[PDB]
Amino acid sequence: TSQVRQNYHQDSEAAINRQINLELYASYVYLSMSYYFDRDDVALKNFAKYFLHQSHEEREHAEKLMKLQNQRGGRIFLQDIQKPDADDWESGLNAMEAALHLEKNVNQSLLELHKLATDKNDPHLADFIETHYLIKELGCHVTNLRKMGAPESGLAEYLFDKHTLG
Amino acid sequence: TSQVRQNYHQDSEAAINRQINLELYASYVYLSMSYYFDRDDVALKNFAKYFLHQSHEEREHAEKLMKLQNQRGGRIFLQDIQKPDADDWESGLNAMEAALHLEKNVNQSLLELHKLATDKNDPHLADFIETHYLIKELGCHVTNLRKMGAPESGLAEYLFDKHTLG
Amino acid sequence: TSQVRQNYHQDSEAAINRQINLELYASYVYLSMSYYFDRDDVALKNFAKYFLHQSHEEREHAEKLMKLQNQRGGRIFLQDIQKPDADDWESGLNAMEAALHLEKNVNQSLLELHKLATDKNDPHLADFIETHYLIKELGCHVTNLRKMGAPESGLAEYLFDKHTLG
Amino acid sequence: TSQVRQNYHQDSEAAINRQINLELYASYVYLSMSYYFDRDDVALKNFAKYFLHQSHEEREHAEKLMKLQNQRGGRIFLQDIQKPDADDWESGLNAMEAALHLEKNVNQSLLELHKLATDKNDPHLADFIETHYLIKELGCHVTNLRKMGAPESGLAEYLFDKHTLG
Amino acid sequence: TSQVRQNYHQDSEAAINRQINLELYASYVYLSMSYYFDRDDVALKNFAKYFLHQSHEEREHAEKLMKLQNQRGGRIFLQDIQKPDADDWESGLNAMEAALHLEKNVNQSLLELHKLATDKNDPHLADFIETHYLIKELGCHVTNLRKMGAPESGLAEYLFDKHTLG
Amino acid sequence: TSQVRQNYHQDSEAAINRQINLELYASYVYLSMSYYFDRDDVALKNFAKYFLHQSHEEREHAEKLMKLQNQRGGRIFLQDIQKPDADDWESGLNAMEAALHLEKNVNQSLLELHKLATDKNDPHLADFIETHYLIKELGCHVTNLRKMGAPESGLAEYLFDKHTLG
């Protein structure tokens, strides 16, 4: 090629295709986590709308990644989206850790992306990718869930529902 | 099975899972066709902001099914989300006619859903596709693009962009 | 054929149109009666403003069906609007008795429509019609008037005009 | 017849009960013309707002007359309202021009009744005619389309649908 | 038959009189359930607001039918209103669970009233069922109390008394 | 048992409960009647919106007794709510006539409840009752109607609706 591209590598153009999927995955996942806490033998809305909100949130990420190609110049190639690993997320504490673990791999994907954003001397790519993500909050809640009665306390969670997910 | 269920001939619960996927696909394909029209060798923002905005709405077509599952008593099984057929489309009219067939499909599996539902005695289920699943539109856009010299008269597309999307 | 026709059967399409020549007949009837009461020599000034609104808000049914046909892919085939029965409407209940009578045939045709709307298994049709038009109220005007002494008492007349229809 | 009747010929009235039958027909035609442009294969919204609007405005045009009758101590004698004429109208251009002829006709009948007003010195009858009626505006559209590429250039009666009817 | 009665079976009516009396019983229980908690030896003001609030809504649900009955031209025939069933209800958990078993009952008598409608095609009757009824909320409640410790844990049905009924 | 019991006797307690089932019988009776006038073949809308109110504010007396009961340490032992005599309520005053005739037996009971409150020298019960429920208003209405010629003058009926019940 287009009249726009310049200093943009074919590798870099493939990676975003890769992330565009991975971030789309996470939306699928959190989506999957969101309605598990909406079903009655769990009944933990808030946990619901928390994950639905992280689901809408990574549902973007991509959507801004797709802007990043239709702007650096590349072409967006979309691949299927995968069903999640589980289907009964056991509990609040389990979920978060899973979310906890899902958000690392997502970020690992980017950490090597900037490592590709430097090896191909793309500063307009050596930006934008470093500041829209990151974990740790999803840590914490783990500690906040660990030290309580989770995932036993069912009581330790219905309280975590109000005073940290309200 | 669970505690809320009653008068929910499982057979339909299976199908509920299938719209979930279906409508998701819709939201995928519309996601596709949305960020092609942001491509710089197309640059048709409004066409984007339209498809970008049909994707979000057929997504919540599905979000507002996974709520119907839990509710009537069911259980939500997700599956992979397959890519669209392209992977990057042809023209506004081509995109338009596209959704047309697509929404005709996603509507086909619902009038195929009223039946089975309009039989297995689920007055509940009978009144949540009856309240808000409808396409007509598009079909009436298709017309507005053909008659104007689309999909070649690029001037037709660009004027359609500012007047029936602005 | 039409590009958005789907599950829309021809028996249906032709019976809609047969219903539009009813819903424009009453409008003409309610119009016919609205201005028998604007006559200087009975001059029930509300019964005039009442049946007027009725002819108005029963030319809106027939319109909403025209919005419907055109939305289901159909084609519209209007016919002559016959003229009501008789030009002198006598009095008050007798026209209220007329308007009752008239509403009931309009109801019975829609019941012949919906009964036809579940033979071809149309969800969209059968949900559109049933969410709108009924009747009763006039039932409680014929009574009142028959209960007060109408129509044969002129003081009964004017009072209901001035205390029910204001 | 009547006590209020005065200076009103037979003759004048009958000449009112046939201009009502006319103004009525015109709305029935404007209806037929407005919903023609509400189809899925025509797709002109502002055309469908226009004639529907003249539809009501002639509805009223016929009503004022009605009251004129009773005010004149007349007796309205309603006849059947005839269908069009046309179902396909069938382009933008070919519609107004059939309304122009439609409007040049109804006005032709105004003038005769008014000459009937001067042949009976019915001045309260004349001043009803020369207040809020007549054509032209259709004309200046008719020219506008032709000058634009109708009916050969759908892009014409499109851009006329938004630039003079929005 | 009655003048407004049309397309209404005996049979449908006498069913309404057996669904009225039922929604009626549905309120009485809630009262019995509200003021149970209004005791000095049970001490949950929020539960007490919550079944007294249901008690007010099922009564409305009962008034809604009366009105349809007559509106259908039916003749309401009231019966005794039977008593609970229970005076000690006799914890938070156990109250909910009998409210769930209760709501499933009255909904059962809806679904068979609805199917009653289909076996005659009574579409005005049918739209009164699928608009403003059903449970779930009681489902999604019972779980929470269970998971928290109820009835083995007054500290739970206390805590649930604020954090989901404040 | 009880810990807030003191100077509350068991003739009292068992007479309070007896009084609630009185005051719920009134509600049921007013409710049987409100939707009597809602019948198409009487339709005195205000008679319906009044007695409907009476059935409220006499379903609210009974509730004000349960709060009292539980306050004074007691227990609530509700019973079957017997049904009103006759489903057809004749006319306007006949319903009014009954309506007084029925207040005179809730008051008569209360007056019998009070004499029990001084013979056991209760102040808090003897003050709560004498500051709430009385009668006569209806007394004036039975007269007005009988003065006008009710019920037998349907015109005396409907006016009283409009000028006194509105």
Residue numbers in the entry:
A (entry chain D), B (entry chain C), C (entry chain G), D (entry chain H), E (entry chain X), F (entry chain W): 5 to 170
Give verbatim lines from the article.
It is a nearly spherical 24-subunits protein with an exterior diameter of about 12 nm and a hollow cavity of 8 nm. We have described here a protein-engineering approach to convert the 8-mer protein assembly with C4 symmetry into the 16-mer, 24-mer, and 48-mer protein nanocages with higher symmetry by controlling the intra- or inter-subunit disulfide bond.
To answer this question, we prepared the third NF-8 mutant termed Δ3C-∇C where cysteine residues (Cys90, Cys102, and Cys130) were replaced by alanine (Ala) while Asp144 was mutated to Cys. After E. coli cells expressing this mutant were lysed, we found that four overexpressed products occurred as shown in native PAGE, suggesting that one polypeptide can simultaneously produce four different protein species. However, we only found conditions which are suitable for the growth of crystals with the 24-merΔ3C-∇C and the above largest species, but not for 8-merΔ3C-∇C and 16-merΔ3C-∇C crystals.
